[PDB]
Amino acid sequence: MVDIIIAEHAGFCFGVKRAVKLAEESLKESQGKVYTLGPIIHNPQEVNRLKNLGVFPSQGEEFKEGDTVIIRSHGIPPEKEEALRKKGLKVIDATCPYVKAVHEAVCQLTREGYFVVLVGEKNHPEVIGTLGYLRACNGKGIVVETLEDIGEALKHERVGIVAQTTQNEEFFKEVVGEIALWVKEVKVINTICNATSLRQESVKKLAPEVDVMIIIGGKNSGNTRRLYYISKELNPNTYHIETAEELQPEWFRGVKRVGISAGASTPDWIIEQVKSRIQEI
Amino acid sequence: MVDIIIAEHAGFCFGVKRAVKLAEESLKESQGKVYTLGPIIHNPQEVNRLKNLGVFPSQGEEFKEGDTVIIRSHGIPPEKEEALRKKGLKVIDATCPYVKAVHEAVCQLTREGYFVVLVGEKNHPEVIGTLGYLRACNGKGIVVETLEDIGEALKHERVGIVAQTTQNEEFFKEVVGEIALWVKEVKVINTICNATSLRQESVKKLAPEVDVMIIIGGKNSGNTRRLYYISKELNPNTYHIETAEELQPEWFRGVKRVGISAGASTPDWIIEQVKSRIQEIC
Ligand code: F3S
Ligand code: F3S
C-alpha cells in the first residue's frame, strides 16, 4: 500500500543511461586510458563524476594505441569509427539503439529505391552520422531542417522520410504531409524516439496516485518545466526542485505517498539524494 | 464583337470526356440497346443530349442479354462488372485511367503487406468500387472520411495510404501526417487527380487578365461554385450562369476581353452556346 516512488523513466533517457553504463563498465580491465569522444553529455557534474572514475572527455586526437574510446549516443560516420579502430583504439560503441535504427532505416530505404529525406538539424552530430551511413550504403538524400529544404526531394518520384531521433513531431508531420502532396510515392519510417513521451506519461500515471509530486531539474530547464506542468494539472500539490536542499520538511505533513520524477539532465544519484532526504522527513 | 477566351481546362476532365466519347462510339458496335450504368454525369442537359443519340441512362436492371452497358468514370466493384458480363451484356469499361490507378495501388499496397487507408467519401461510388478491388486482392483496410476514422489504422504497424481521386489535398495532408506520427511505417501513393487544381489555377490566371469573367455550371455543383468565388475574388465582374439565357447584355458594355470557364459537369457544347451568345451580344 504505502509508497514513496520514483517514476519510471525519470532522468536520463535510455540511450544516455546505457552510454553511462558502458563507460563505467569499460574501466574494469582497461589496459589503457579510457576516453569518451568529447563529453558524454551536456551536464558538467556528470562529466566530472565520470572523470573522477577515470573516464576522460577527449579534447582532440590525444588518445593512443591501446586506449579506449567511447562513441557518444549520437553516433559518428562509419568511416570515422573505422579510422579510430585503425589507430589501434579499443572502440566502445555507445551509439543509441534508436540512433542505430535511423542508420538502418536510411539504408533500408536506399535498398528499396527511395531518395532519402532526413528531417532534422543539419549541423547536429546525429544527423552527420546518419549522412555517413546513407553515403556508405550508396544512398542519396538531403537534410530537411525547414520547409524550404524540401525542393530537392520534390524532383524525385519516390521519397523515403526518416527523422532525427529528437525531431519535433509537429514539424515532422508537416514535412511528411507536404512532401506527400508533391511526389508520387512517399515512404515514412518514423524514427522519432519515445524518451520524452515515456518520461511524461509515467509522471501522468504517478501524479494522481500520490499525495505530493517532486519534479527534479534545473529551474530554467525547459523539459523539467514541462514535466512540472504536466504533474501540476493532475496534482496541484506539486513542487519543482533542483537539489535535495530545497526539500522542505513542512511539505510532507500528513502525506502517506511521495512521487518523484526528474528532467532529462538529472542523473540518478541526484534523484537518489532527493529520495534519501525525503525518507528522513 | 470582341475577344473571347475560353480558359484552359474549362469543363469536363480527361476521364469524363473519355467516358462520353466511349459512350458515343459504342453506338457503332452495339446491336442491342446502349445504356450507361446510371446517368453518365450530373447534368440533365448532357444526359438528355446522349439520350437523344441512343445512349440511355439506366434506372435499374432493365438491360437485357445483348444490350451494351457503359461503366461510368468512377468505376464499379470487380464482382459487379463480372455480374454484368455473366448476364450476357456487352460491357464497355469507361472507368477513368486515374481511378483504375487507385484500384492498382490498393492491390500493390496489399501485396507489399500494408493495411490500406483510403482517404475519401465512404458512400461515394468511386470509393465503393475501390473497396471492391481491395477485397478482391485479399487486402484489408478502411475509408477515412474524417480524422476520427483513423483509429483502426493506428492498430497496425504498416499502413498504406491512397486517396479518392477528388479528395481535397488539405485533409489528405493532415491524415498522412497524423498516421505517420502513430505508426511505424507509412507508405503513401498519392492518387489525387490534378483536374480540379488545373481548372482553378487557369481561372486564377485568366481572371485579372480580362474585363468580365463568365463561370458556367449547375448551381448545386460545389466545384463550379468554387470557380465562381475564386474568380469573383480576383475580378468583381465574375458572373455565374447555368445557361446562355442568363447572359445579360448589360454585363458586356464597353468590354474588350471576355473570359469563360466552366465546372467539371459542363460539356463543351454548352460553353460554345455561351461563347456565341456573347458574340451575339457584341
Ligand atoms: S539517447 Fe535518448 S533521447 Fe532517445 S535517441 Fe536515445 S533514448
Ligand atoms: S474522371 Fe476526372 S477529375 Fe480526374 S480522376 Fe479522372 S480525370
DSSP letter string, chain B: --EEEEPTT-S--HHHHHHHHHHHHHTTT-SS-EEESS-SSS-HHHHHHHHHHTEEE--SS---TT-EEEE-TT---HHHHHHHHHTT-EEEE---HHHHHHHHHHHHHHHTTPEEEEES-TT-HHHHHHHHHHHHTT--EEEESSGGGGGGGGGSSEEEEEE-TT--HHHHHHHHHHHHHHSSEEEEE----THHHHHHHHHHHHGGGSSEEEEES-TT-HHHHHHHHHHHHH-TTEEEESSGGG--GGGGTT-SEEEEEE-TT--HHHHHHHHHHHHHH-
The CA distances from residue A17 to A28, A224, B263, in Å, are 18, 18, 62
- Domain boundaries along the sequence of chain B: 1-12+195-282, 13-95, 96-194
Longest dimension (CA), chain B: 65
> A167: CA distance to ligand 1 center in Å?
11
Residue from B46, B81, B126, B145 carrying the catalytic annotation: B126
Task: Classify strands A185-189 and B185-189 as parallel, antiparallel or unpaired.
Answer: antiparallel
Ligand nearest to the CA of A126: 1
CA dihedral A195, A199, A205, A208 (to 10 degrees): -160
Question: Given this chain, do its domains A1-12+195-281 and A96-194 carry the same CATH topology?
Answer: yes
Output the CATH code of domain B13-95: 3.40.50.11270
Q: What residues of chain A have any CB closer than 8 angstroms to a CB in chain B?
A: 169, 172-174, 176-178, 180-181, 183-190, 192
Cβ < 6 Å from ligand 1: which residues? A 13-16, 73, 96, 98-99, 165-166, 193, 195
Question: In this structure, are residues B158 and B138 in contact, taking their beta carbons and an 8 Å threshold?
Answer: no
- The CATH architecture of the domain made up of A96-194 is 3-Layer(aba) Sandwich (3.40)
One-letter amino acid at B183 equals: V
The C-alpha atoms of residue B79 and residue B71 are separated, in whole angstroms, by: 13
Please name the residue whose Cα sits nearest to atom 4 of ligand 1: A193
* DSSP-derived 3-state class of residue A156: coil
Which chain B residues touch A if contact means CB-CB below 8 Å? 169, 172-174, 176-178, 180-181, 183-190, 192
Q: Please give the Cα distance from A274 to B8 (Å, whole number).
A: 73
Pick from B177, B184, B185: CB nearest A174: B177
Closest by CA position to A259, among listed A222, A205, A221: A205
- Alpha-carbon distance A138 to nearest alpha carbon in chain B (angstroms): 22
> A190–B172: do the CB atoms touch at under 8 Å?
no
Residue closest via CA to ligand 2's atom 1 equals B15
| Cβ(B73) – ligand 2 distance below 6 Å | yes
CATH for A1-12+195-281 is 3.40.1010.20
* B86: exposed, middle or buried (Cβ count in 10 Å: 0-12, 13-18, 19+): exposed
Chain position carrying cell 458572373 = B239
B188/A187 touch (CB, cutoff 8 Å), yes or no: yes
Ligand 2 atom index nearest CA of B264: 3
C-alpha–C-alpha distance, residues B198 and B8, integer Å: 8
Q: What backbone torsions phi and psi does residue B273 show, to the nearest 5 degrees?
A: -60, -45
This structure was determined by X-ray
CATH tag for B1-12+195-282 (out of 3.40.50.300, 3.40.1010.20, 1.25.10.10, 3.30.70.260):
3.40.1010.20
Hey, what's the torsion of the CAs at A200, A206, A212, A213, to 10 degrees? -20
Q: B225, exposed or middle or buried, with CB in 10 Å at 0-12, 13-18, 19+?
A: middle
Put simply, the answer to whether A188 touches B189 (Cβ < 8 Å) is no
Element (H, E) at A203: helix A195-206
Strand runs (DSSP E) across chain A, as ranges?
3-6, 34-36, 55-57, 68-71, 90-93, 115-119, 141-144, 158-163, 185-189, 212-216, 238-241, 257-262
